[PDB]
Amino acid sequence: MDKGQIYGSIIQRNYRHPISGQIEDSGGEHSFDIGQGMVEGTVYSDAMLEVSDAGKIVLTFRMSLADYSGNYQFWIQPGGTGSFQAVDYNITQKGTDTNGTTLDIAISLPTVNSIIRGSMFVEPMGREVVFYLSASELIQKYSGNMLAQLVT
């Protein structure tokens, strides 16, 4: 583990891609209001951003409703443009809220200037969903219970 900084971050949660304006989820344009609420209800806004002095970055976000979903896959898109690049993730912690299991998902980023695309199957919906996340509004001092993967 390396010298660096641990920030609090606010996750921008998007049903509609913030750069292209396109919705990839099969719900499409006519479902924007329910889709946006669904992303917001699933992914917590408060997150952790680790930046080592050497330049490595790890973003941890928290997913609610994990008892109802699965087959998580993630892609990175630097600058929010160009191709989606498949990326590994690690569950660094599990917790609980009023909906059951929560998962802390850690993903390495080439830059904070990055879109994360996620997809997963949702059991009660009987279909897979596609959404976008990105980190902003950095807070110098992280406050919360996520577990640091990278920096001391």
Burial of 24 (0-12, 13-18, 19+ CB in 10 A): middle
Pure H helices in 14-55? 32-42
Region from 3-11, 75-83, 101-109, 117-125 binding ligand HEM, contact rule CB under 6 A: 117-125
Residue nearest to ligand HEM (CB): 27
Three-state DSSP at 67 gives: helix
Q: Determine how β-strand 114-122 pairs with β-strand 127-139.
A: antiparallel
Applying CB under 6 A, which of residues 6, 9, 14, 15 lies at the interface with ligand HEM?
15
Asked if 150 touches ligand HEM (CB under 6 A), the answer is no
CA distance 40 to 131: 10
Applying CB under 6 A, which of residues 37, 55, 100, 144 lies at the interface with ligand HEM?
37
127 is known to lie in a ligand binding site: yes
Residues written for the chain: 152
User: Taking the complex as a whole, how short is the minimal distance between the CB of residue 97 and ligand HEM, in angstroms?
Assistant: 7
Asked if 124 touches ligand HEM (CB under 6 A), the answer is yes
> Dihedral angle at the C-alpha atoms of 136, 104, 141, 79, nearest 10 degrees?
-20
Applying CB under 6 A, which of residues 6, 39, 135, 150 lies at the interface with ligand HEM?
39
Region from 54-62, 100-108, 120-128, 132-140 binding ligand HEM, contact rule CB under 6 A: 120-128
CA distance 24 to 51: 30
Asked if 99 touches ligand HEM (CB under 6 A), the answer is yes
125 is known to lie in a ligand binding site: yes
CA distance 119 to 71: 8
- Binding positions for ligand HEM, rule: CB under 6 A: 15, 25, 27, 31, 34-35, 37-42, 65, 68-69, 98-99, 122, 124-125, 127, 129, 131
Q: Which residues are annotated as a binding site?
A: 38, 125, 127
